[PDB]
Design a binder for this molecule. Structure first.
Ligand code: NA
Lengths: 379, 10, 382, 10
């Protein structure tokens, strides 16, 4: 049977665009860059799979004839993005697939499916989380993942019943986000490691007020070796990462000798000004005392810069330096009006959290934390 | 540039 | 000699530095990426020179103390783009330049000027020309210039001057673009031509001027081009660029006196269609079959994919099918700035004329007189 | 791909 359907230009383009995000670029197995189109009873299914990551979306379409066909991914996405806002008519004839839309007519070759792998079955459902929370949390934590060191390239997902903990580190920063979700099956006590770039890219995409996470259930959580992600009309899988995540909880300070609260916008805009002179973006310095923060960067031979900000500060005054990018990375993941820094010494990790005597100061309980290692002041 | 005090890994 | 000290409005200072910076080299001699600040009676002068291109801009400022100082152009430009909307205080103290604005305080090291070359004098002014049209004309023809220094005489924009007009031409051997502009000479009759690096002249055009006209400085009479410089003077601004020392091809012989076929069509429609059909073009051509009332575009192959699209066209004369490099074609269509394009054709293997359309018989058709023309060589059909 | 008929140059 030969696939033939009519579809709206906008729904077709957006769906193909969603899939095309997860296709490989220049794959050793060229057919893996294909997009699979399947006409069913419900309508049209659009999928891609490269043995590692799969993406499948359903879109309404008028199916004149059931069937499936594999066509080149980047070409289809480029064509569909370039068509007029008219209906699109797709029709498989022989070894070609005809795509007509208004005055424009395309004739693409079919790809062979003999060496094209089948979509994996998604694991059993584990839990449900709101879509906006999911995007935000993944987006927060992924900023701290290594880009290699396989154990640093993943996001750790710990599940303890209703609670979920996401974590990632690259040895210089550590981001941890805790959230609550709705369990699908029974109580679950488990942890997996998901490739960060892949999970972060999936989150940035659309998904639908809810996101269903499929990792299995009972004693088989993690067994299929897969994380399934489901939203309204969309299903995706990623292979889990085979590496042990470092023990990170011991790193989080129970208390601080100094704490500082400041506006995130104020601080960020100022960090960008001062870091302008940092040779290779080496370091920015933060001098805390009284009610003012002094930022500085640069050196004698390249140029210096400094800026004073009002700041709510308590405890023993200190000067501490950071990688400016690591610092703005942290600041940008807070999603709060203010940040509270928790310090001990210039050479020990600093805590940034979304936002009292002489100290010491108990660590604040927050759903999100970004632990940043300092760099050494020049000496 | 010290690292975070991961043991192992620093 | 005194230390430079001034106060300036941030917008004025940032715009002027940005303007200079576009013309700085990104260099074998580090100090040539420097920007020279000079505080005078009239205010503040900002300039860069690297032996080949100079740019000088004057802006209003409160000069507390006269002097000059050379600083990193890259660093100054980055700092000024990031300052808050507050007055900028600049003060030279020893080997550094202090720059303060709001709560922000910067300190740039000063550069040695002993190997920093002095700005060249502009040649005598040769004529005045509308600043917008001049910029437009340069950007039009620059699309046709060669980019490969293997062949110097293709990397230039030829500037022909006459008592009545300026003619700009560029070619890379595959396309030729020629634009004519009215101007008014200072001395009356002149007949001369120089060659200017396309890249640097095009950059001077995008950078922009604040007034409505600019003066071209090439000299006068027998002394045109003698200085080896083209100068451009506008309000508050002057620039110079060194002339190319190469001979431009004899190009007017390439322009066909008549056409066996002619077609007119909307530029936006044809352009959008070409970009659609060329999605299947590997690397390399798009095919145009012209009939009465219809143009069928097509491209591709059995191994990658084929695509075709039909457009209404106003066509006259001998039907033909002709193919082009799709990128050279949309480059020309995009350089037209008119609503419709007229194609002038002879044979499938001879140059095609693209002209802004104005306001169809049997042929042959006499070539049209226009201010602009983009001449494009075809590629052979398979 | 012919050039424009520049003489010389082509
Ligand atoms: Na100067």
């Amino acid at each position: 049977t030969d696939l033939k359907f009519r579809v709206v230009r906008e729904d077709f383009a957006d769906a193909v665009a969603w899939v095309a995000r997860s296709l490989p670029t220049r794959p050793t197995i060229p057919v893996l860059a294909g997009v699979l189109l399947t006409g069913t009873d419900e309508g049209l299914t659009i999928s891609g799979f490269d043995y590692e990551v799969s993406a499948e979306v359903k879109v309404s379409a008028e199916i004149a004839s059931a069937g499936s066909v594999l066509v080149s991914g980047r070409l289809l996405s480029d064509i569909t993005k370039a068509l007029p806002a008219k209906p699109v008519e797709v029709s498989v004839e022989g070894t070609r697939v005809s795509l007509t839309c208004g005055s424009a007519r395309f004739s693409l070759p079919t790809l062979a499916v003999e060496d094209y792998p089948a979509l994996p079955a998604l694991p059993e459902e584990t839990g449900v989380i709101a879509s906006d929370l999911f995007a935000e949390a993944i987006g927060q934590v992924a900023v701290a993942a290594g880009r290699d060191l396989p154990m640093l390239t993943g996001i750790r997902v710990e599940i303890s019943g209703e609670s979920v903990v996401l974590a990632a580190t690259d040895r210089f920063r550590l981001a941890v986000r805790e959230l609550t979700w709705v369990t699908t099956a029974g109580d679950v006590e488990a942890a997996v490691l998901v490739p960060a770039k892949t999970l972060a890219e999936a989150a940035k995409a659309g998904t639908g007020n809810q996101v269903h996470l499929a990792l299995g259930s009972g004693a088989s959580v993690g067994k299929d070796g897969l994380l399934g992600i489901r939203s309204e009309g969309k299903r995706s899988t990623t292979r889990l990462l085979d590496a042990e995540f470092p023990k990170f909880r011991q790193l989080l300070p129970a208390e601080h000798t100094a704490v500082a609260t400041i506006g995130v916008a104020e601080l960020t805009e100022a960090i960008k000004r001062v870091a302008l002179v940092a040779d290779r973006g080496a370091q920015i310095r933060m001098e805390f005392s009284d009610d003012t923060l002094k930022l500085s960067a640069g050196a004698d031979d390249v140029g210096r810069a400094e800026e004073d900000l009002p700041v709510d500060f308590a405890g023993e005054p200190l000067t501490i330096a950071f990688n400016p990018t690591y610092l703005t990375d942290g600041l940008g993941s807070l999603h709060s009006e203010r940040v509270t820094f928790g310090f001990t010494t210039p050479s020990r990790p600093a805590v940034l959290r979304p936002a009292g005597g002489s100290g010491p100061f108990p660590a604040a309980k927050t759903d999100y934390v970004y632990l940043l290692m300092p760099v050494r002041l020049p000496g | 540039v010290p690292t975070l005090p991961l043991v192992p890994x620093g």
